[PDB]
Symmetry: none
Subunit: 104 residues, 14 copies
């Protein structure tokens, strides 16, 4: 039910956070490309799981993805990675119904 | 069905944009409280319309409101207004399924 | 009718009381987050039930959660849990039309 | 329609705040009954206005009065006034749909 | 006009009398809790009907309810039930304009 | 089954072709904006139908929409409309399994 | 799982890009013929791998192939090569779920 | 195993023969278009069944279709229908391992 | 009573698996401590049962508990939970005489 | 009734931690005096609860107190407070079966 | 009965004190190692005796062992030996019900 | 009931008086040590009996012990034994409700 | 609760210490009677308070009084006062659960 | 109520009379020690019953006990028993409100 949706959001975030980790030792120049590559893989699995376990969540997920890709797409190379991460995490919190979408 | 939801988003944005306008001629130190006052009024109408025309949209609307209010709540006085507007416009675009949630 | 609303309030309280129970053995420093996690799950179900059985109750419900969450949000770590429970218990009683909103 | 409700909430708060003012110079031991006397008068007008301009608001209003009245009713003489004001302020904010029901 | 008010009083009394009936078999230590539970349910319906059919009657209904609840609230456990019933039946008769408010 | 998917593709194309029609009498400067506005409305309905009738089709649909919007997004104002239409019809044909994706 | 599909897309693209390379030194009029010959070989392997590792991907792959062969099939000799490459790269991006299907 | 493949070939032929039937009462100039439309629908179902029951059969099936659509594609309007039917029937017999691929 | 020992191992595993379940919706940074809290409770009961039903099993049990607590103790916050579960799972299998201590 | 023991340990620690808090803004030389007074009060309640809910815990509890009181008793005035706290905290952890009795 | 427990505590202390003796002429950097080796041997015997003569004492014994091993585990090499001895001696006194757990 | 408590007091005194007897021949300097050793043994049994037969008596018993160990603890070596005996016997008489707590 | 008992012990000690004060300026021969007279008055009040606030404390209190009166009763005139004070302060400390019953 | 007090007096007297009976066959020299021993046991039970059933009776009871003990305390060995019995019965009769406190 609505449980499936929650769990999937957890997975997505996990994949997201893991891809971010891949960026640890890569130089700024390659950070976005590195993260992006790692994330694209795990994302598809997540999206597929959604398609069969919680279809209503698919378009929402597509929206957060789009939000991050588009933000980075229009940002200067140097800001792309940060632009994506920032918009993705907030967008995901919104989709999740999390009240504090900004920070601590 | 889904049309009602779209229309309501339009209304919300309209109320939002109008309240922002109330802020035009005021000095920065006041812009937030002025905007907030004007927006609180029109918001309630919008939320009520949602409750009877598209209930599923209510909790979402609540999330985009909380996004904005909470962002401003934790911001320095000088940034509150901008913090609210920025987070509100984006959160609403996300809820609307608008792909470009950042800017032009 | 108005019966649906009553029943939903019962459910909400049940979810609330159950999440509180989850806090049984965790040391004070974790009680809040633990409770928060358990409650966020069950809350969504309740809110969804409201959306289809008693929409007018949704905005009221969104109010109590905010009431509670905001109270804890501004409280010192040590008081957050108690701040939330206290304000949630009362806000729900108010929404329910219960005359004695404080205690025994 | 929802405008009438907002306006009435403003009036109620106004009556409330004014009665509190009556408590300005009275010695702590008589503050509550002094306040109580002043507030009982203005309340009736407000309630009547509600009955003809926004009936749905009446039961909500009767609720918040009972909330404040009952809290003070069970408090020690020395705490009655504060108990009433605190619970009334918050109950009214809840009924108004105000997200921050506690403080600044 | 005034017919609606009469009918509503009938309904209230009916709900009252029915809840009292719920108390039939229960022993003298539970009668109040049992009665209270049964009555709280039916009351809300009645109050809601009043809000839309005869709003002026709402605050009055609130007064008779309070009379009864408050009377029992300050009574010893053993007397609570009787205190409530006695004060409720009379308060309702008064609100109804019934000349013999005491007994046969 | 796979029938639902086919039908939905038909609907999408229909909405697309209709929005294009909205453009016949507008000169260059307004063509994209106009089309975009008309299409955004009908698209949401289609996407919603997909979410409940053929979820696997959602991400594919998100793709063609993405294909089209992005192509126009990076095109000079004068070419945006044509860029969108061209990429949309082809992407849709691909998603539909239509062998001749270019023209005749 | 969905990983197999991703990997196969990578392989396909690799075979594609390699065949394109074969065209590096042939004069325009032979570029297509040359490319076509080199690509036909490697394609079969890729398609076979799909048949056993990710069957659902086969019909999609067939589409992309058809997309390009058909585009070139109807193009003037001088444009055939470019027609194939353009349509193949985009069709593959669509099948891959790549949002930017056009260019940099 | 190999039974599934046989059965699917039967289905395909059935769909093919049925679509041909749709062409009976229409005049030649309309035969092809009509047949094509009817066949495109049923084909997709068949192809999908193949994807999950006998993947190795997919590329083969894609060959008969290709063979047919391409034969008609290059034929004069008047011959298209016959060109398709002739090539489809034979290609399918070849794929089926039927020794007499021409006629009786 | 080698039976008693077996049964106790079952209980321990049950308590373990249940505590893990408590970790179901809590964010990762909290999983370990949430799990730890839930497990510490049920563990004591199990250990006490061992003390009176199968004393020889007590020191073994303290060993698998130590194995897990120590593994997590020296792990980075992010790995603690996984470190504990992995080592506990295996250590218990070893103590149980289970030949496949790793996985499937 | 091992649950009762756990709960009591929680209470004891709570009383302990609270008394420590009483020491916050008092000058060092005043610390111990203050803490001791606050703690002696709450301790008795805890011990009494133990006497009726978990008697076996009483002598253990008397051991931690003796531990702490005696440690401070033999310490120089300047070290008494720290001597008590240090020994009390560890002794309680030992009695609780907590493996890490020293620190983090 | 309780005699067995006392005797076992004596044995444990004896083993402990003997192992300490082994540390007699070993250079400081080697003291903890040496002691640990000697103590691990004798400890097992003691623990086994407990398992059959006084099982309830086993879990307690594991606690004082864990107290000492953990204290040294987190101490700088130079302090490990002293950390272990200090925490072991006290933890054992606590388990024994000895009132003066610190020194004299 | 209260009988159990009386009997236990008798036992305690018996253990006490017996330990004192152990001191019969040892010279003054060692007298306290000797007595202490003998008494510590028998005391534990008595305390355990109390824990299961009369828990309320445990904390009282701890008081008498404490009273005696503390009195001797602060006495000069030469007076320790006498200090303990005197305070123990009197403290025990007080706990027993014996009116003449001093002598004959 | 157990709080009442504590408070009463405080009162008793206060009355005791106050009566002692009455003795400051009286020479030996009159000291006991003076103290005795002053104490007998205040004692009764204390005992009465106990009878209604903490009955279980009465017999204990009777014990401490008995200890003091009896000790003095058998002492030479010159020692009576000191005999009473000494035995009373200790007996009261015992009844209070105070560990150091002798001095500092 | 006052009944409880009466009943307790009956019990006390019964215990008293029974202890006296224990004295039937012992020689004068042991009479008082025999009676005293038997009575001390049963007295405690009675006093405890008073503490929970009729607290106001405790101090009175304490007072008669004291009357009898003290009378015997100051009597020659040969008269102790008779001194106690005589004063106890009369004292008890007085406490009971019995008019003839001397004899028949
Ligand atoms: As942002
Ligand atoms: As409050
Ligand atoms: As009355
Ligand atoms: As193109
Ligand atoms: As491992
Ligand atoms: As230490
Ligand atoms: As003494
Ligand atoms: Zn863009
Ligand atoms: Zn932000
Ligand atoms: Zn916040
Ligand atoms: Zn942004
Ligand atoms: Zn806030
Ligand atoms: Zn409150
Ligand atoms: Zn009340
Ligand atoms: Zn508050
Ligand atoms: Zn009241
Ligand atoms: Zn009355
Ligand atoms: Zn782009
Ligand atoms: Zn094209
Ligand atoms: Zn073609
Ligand atoms: Zn293109
Ligand atoms: Zn062709
Ligand atoms: Zn041919
Ligand atoms: Zn370690
Ligand atoms: Zn490992
Ligand atoms: Zn000491
Ligand atoms: Zn330490
Ligand atoms: Zn550690
Ligand atoms: Zn120490
Ligand atoms: Zn001391
Ligand atoms: Zn003495
Ligand atoms: Zn005497
Ligand atoms: Zn002394
Ligand atoms: Zn005397
Ligand atoms: Zn006499």
């Amino acid at each position: 039910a609505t449980t499936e949706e929650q769990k999937l959001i957890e997975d997505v975030n996990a994949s997201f956070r893991a891809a971010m980790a891949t960026t640890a030792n890569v130089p700024p120049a390659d950070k976005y490309k590195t993260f992006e590559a790692a994330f694209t893989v795990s994302s598809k699995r997540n999206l597929a799981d959604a398609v069969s376990k919680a279809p209503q969540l698919v378009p929402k997920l597509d929206e957060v993805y789009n939000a991050a890709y588009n933000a980075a797409d229009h940002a200067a190379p140097e800001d792309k990675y940060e632009a994506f991460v920032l918009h993705f995490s907030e967008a995901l919190r919104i989709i999740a119904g999390t009240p504090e979408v900004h920070a601590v």
